[PDB]
Structure 1
Amino acid sequence: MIVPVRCFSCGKVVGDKWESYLNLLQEDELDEGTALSRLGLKRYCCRRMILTHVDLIEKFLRYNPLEKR
């Protein structure tokens, strides 16, 4: 849905490393592993936390809001 704040196993705060990850993947044309290493995710728990996340919220944000002010 949206990037989890903390890695489930260890607890490293990885909710602030999603937009940086996407910018690395897009602007710097880095592959996934090098970007994960760059962000500081050395344990494969955090690496699977950030690597396999699916950003469903974009989909949810396409629909017009039910309550619009």
Structure 2
Amino acid sequence: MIVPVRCFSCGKVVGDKWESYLNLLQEDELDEGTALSRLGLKRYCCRRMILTHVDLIEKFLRYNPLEKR
């Protein structure tokens, strides 16, 4: 749903890199491998954690029971 704090396999903190990954994908015209490398993700265990994240939290957040729609 929301980005995991750490990589499952090794434990490297990858929770602070999802927004940067999106920025490097959108603003810069970087491919996914280049963006992951420039974030500091060398092991494929760490690369998959960001390369394959879905970010369903944004779709969950549109159903807000506390604000008039």
- TM-score, normalising length from structure 1? 0.92
Aligned length: 69
Q: Identity of paired residues, percent?
A: 100
Deviation at 1:29, TM superposition (A): 1.3
Deviation at 1:33, TM superposition (A): 0.4
C-alpha distance in 1, partners of 2:65/2:14? Answer: 28
C-alpha distance in 2, partners of 1:11/1:67? Answer: 37
Deviation at 1:18, TM superposition (A): 0.4
CA gap of 1:18–1:68, structure 2 versus 1, over 3 A, is same
C-alpha distance in 2, partners of 1:21/1:52? Answer: 12
C-alpha distance in 2, partners of 1:65/1:33? Answer: 39
- TM-score, normalising length from structure 2? 0.92
Deviation at 1:8, TM superposition (A): 0.3
Render the CA deviation track for 1:18-50: whole Å, top value 9, x for unaligned. 000000000001110000000000000000011
Deviation at 1:67, TM superposition (A): 7.9
Higher mean C-alpha deviation, range 15-24 or range 56-65: 56-65
C-alpha distance in 2, partners of 1:65/1:16? Answer: 28
Deviation at 1:66, TM superposition (A): 4.7
